[PDB]
């Protein structure tokens, strides 16, 4: 469905924050390196703190549009029976007498 | 300046609200009817001070109408301007004629003609403002004043002021 | 006027311990968010007290504080002395201690000289993660009338 | 000056021109949809309205008594005596 | 436009207002044109 | 319904009486220093300087609030928001006399805390000037005396020359540095 | 045991107090010689009633800000500190990285059980989810 | 209501950044000790 | 600045008075031989009158900013040109008292402030258990 699709959506811009996070502690870590004068990790320090940015930057995207397509929806795709039973019991009554 | 004054208000109660929530719409009908207003007499009647200790008092029947009414004792910030007072404030305005200046509830304009000799009206600058060598003054910065006169219109005060003299202007 | 200032960003932070071990008497505890925003008040505050203090550092290590003849040295010498202490927390600088031991590397011998350029080394370190700073920043964006219709169901007139 | 309760000497009975008076009072405030300190047994006009609240002493009002000088003695409805 | 001077006095504060009988408000209105003041205070200043 | 005040006045039918205004301290017939409770007793006028009124207002606008959360049973920069965040509880809403006076009195008030505030006023009372020249003496920030006795004109020869020049020195000094 | 680690915090946080109070008192009464004026009024009754007025005094010097200057080895202590920091905060910031990370799969398991929990008919009202199946 | 949702998330995301961003400006740069509980705070 | 100097024997040898609290101040290692006082005691070898005489010489001065017998005195360390100062020690209780800034002890209070609001910090920061629905609870 539509909202299962929301949800879905929504949960990936979770997933999305966790690996900035991730790569906020990589940043961290491999700043630690680089001023202890180990420069080899500058590649991977810089790419994990650029991807967590990057990441971050995407996840924004994402989640900004999400909220606007929440108010878009509204009225449309988003708010703002004994007759079943009946034919559940003659069902069961005419498989009684027709077993 | 900025007082703080012992005032009385006469409300007039209909009989209908002789209920539980009598004291009540009463100090409410005080804070309608007196604050924020402005009189001659006393200035900008601010805020009516512990809302609280308001005494509402007794209230005399009229004879006529059943209706009943108070006089309502409470204490309030005022502000009343006076002549040969010296204040600090904010320009709001500036045209060629002058600028006023904001200051609490109550404007002072300041003519072009009680200001420093070479500082003139530019209307070239953005916004137009007044373009001394050493000064500057438009629609935004702040001002001290000498208030050279008040005008009471029973509503609102409105003053007019200087910043010729000594130890005045540009703040 | 400075040590007015000082004493009066003190004053604060006193108020707010004071203010810390009032909600942590009580048994339930204050709602976290609450426990957090006077962590920040206090955050604020002590900020304000180590930059005006060492704004005041070249001033304020230009003195000499000893009691006056009006303290009561005979009673009691060990308050005055425990408010003239200047040794610092027996665990404060065992943990500096701790920390300079384990900050890398970096053993006296040295000699400076070579201690500069280890200096240098984390400088230009710095600039280049400046840098990367700049760049990375760079590289993100920041019908119809009612009464008419009705006044025709009840007269006829269009 | 206003006279202390403990201090009063004016009757302790209502006047016929106090009573005529609390009753026009309560009759024109009652008709002026105030506030009925009684239970109205049926009664809809707002004299005989006044007479049953004077008549259970639940009239909320309060007699201020001048003196010749300027004075006064005020004297509830409840605590006056209806010998009228 | 609630504005209420009595200039003369440059008064715009100080005012009530009363209810009398129109013949009064003559009256006194008379008793001016003749030179005579009928002022009406609202308050008290000799007590007995 | 035009507000009264606490004292009464002989109406000698001649208006024409009215004095003007003035820094000769010749504040209304409403504003002089020997004035009235509304208890009865005769006390002295009260003038505040900014800081002071500041503070006042807030302190009664917050007295206010809890008022009516009873009767509901049954940095400077971040003042000017939660100011207006007090005004739109308590007050009219259509005050528009005090929301500039609170944006006023935020952004011109040389003092902030309470306690700095007494401090002004312990300081500025031993010199036992008009009600109105402490109150401006503590709104008016001046580094002479000169300019004290230029700004305020009242003062001239109610205090030395040099004591007001330590009282100044004072007053900066307390001033809270925001 | 949870409460007893209440009590260490407690304990802790009780200590700064006392610390920052102290400090602020001291000052109060320096201040107290001059200025003052109302400066003195920070300070503990008991002290106050302690101590007589006119406490302590001051001495000018120059040059202990140039003797500081002239070492230079607190600014490298300061530096290695800071990267010591910067290391206990990595490790702590890693430790929330994977608890989140867990705590994501099992909410965003009941997110899809939920998207799995299928109708629009029935109520539901709310920090856990209710039916109202009557 | 929803719009109020937006503003408060944008607000978020922008402090988030910045705090990052400055905090890893912070540190690299009892004065160190200070620092280190602001690069905490942050 | 940190530390604390007594040589409660040497009252014993002497008795601790005055010029005694001058010459114990000299006893002390908080005393320096780079002053005046002890080329003085030199030449002696090979209180007013020494106030004088320190008018005379050109050097580092210690001189007597108090007496409360017997107990406590200041004995100040001033740079003489005008006179500028150093530091204050003060002899209370048998024991030479270091003179300890200004600056220094502002110092430690803030250090040790700082360190227990660390403290508590962390130990509370790791309590609270967070689900997005609940927030921040506490187990």
Known sequence: ?99 | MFFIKDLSLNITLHPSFFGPRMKQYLKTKLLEEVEGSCTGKFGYILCVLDYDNIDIQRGRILPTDGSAEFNVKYRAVVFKPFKGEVVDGTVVSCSQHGFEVQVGPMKVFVTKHLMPQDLTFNAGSNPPSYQSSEDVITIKSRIRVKIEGCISQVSSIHAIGSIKEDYLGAI | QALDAVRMRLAQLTHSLRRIRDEMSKAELPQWYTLQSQLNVTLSQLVSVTSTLQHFQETLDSTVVYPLPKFPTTSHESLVTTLLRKKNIPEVDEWMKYVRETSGVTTALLKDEEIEKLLQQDREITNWARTTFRNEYGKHDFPFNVDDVLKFTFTGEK | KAIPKDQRATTPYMTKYERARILGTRALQISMNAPVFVDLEGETDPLRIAMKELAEKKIPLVIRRYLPDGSFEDWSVEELIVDL | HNQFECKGCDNKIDIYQIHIPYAAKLLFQELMAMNITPRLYTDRSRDF | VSTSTFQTRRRRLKKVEEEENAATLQLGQEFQLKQINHQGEEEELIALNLSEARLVIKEALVERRRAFKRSQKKTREKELESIDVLLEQTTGGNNKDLKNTMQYLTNFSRFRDQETVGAVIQLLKSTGLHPFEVAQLGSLACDTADEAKTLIPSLNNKISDDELERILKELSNLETLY | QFVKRRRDMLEHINLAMNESSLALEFVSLLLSSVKESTGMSSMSPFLRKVVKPSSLNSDKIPYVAPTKKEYIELDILNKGWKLQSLNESKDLLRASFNKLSSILQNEHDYWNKIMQSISNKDVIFKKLLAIKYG | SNQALYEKLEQTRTILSVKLAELINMTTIAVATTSVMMVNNQ | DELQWKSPEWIQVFGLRTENVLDYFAESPFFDKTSNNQVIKMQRQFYMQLEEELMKLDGTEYVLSSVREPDFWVIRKQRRTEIIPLQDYYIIGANIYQSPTIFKIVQSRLMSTSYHLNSTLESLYDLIEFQPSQGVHYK
Do not use: W
């Not at chain 1, 990790?41 to 397509?69: A, C, G, M, W």
């Open chain 1, 1 to 99: 469905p539509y909202i299962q699709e929301r949800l879905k959506s929504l949960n990936d811009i979770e997933t999305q924050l966790c690996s900035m996070l991730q790569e906020a502690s990589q940043v961290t870590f491999i700043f630690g390196e680089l001023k202890r004068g180990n420069e080899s990790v500058k590649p991977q320090f810089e790419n994990h703190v650029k991807q967590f940015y990057e990441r971050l930057d995407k996840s924004t995207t994402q989640l900004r549009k999400e909220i606007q397509l929440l108010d878009e929806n509204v009225g449309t795709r988003l708010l703002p029976q004994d007759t079943e039973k009946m034919e559940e019991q003659l069902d069961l009554l005419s498989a009684i007498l027709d077993p």
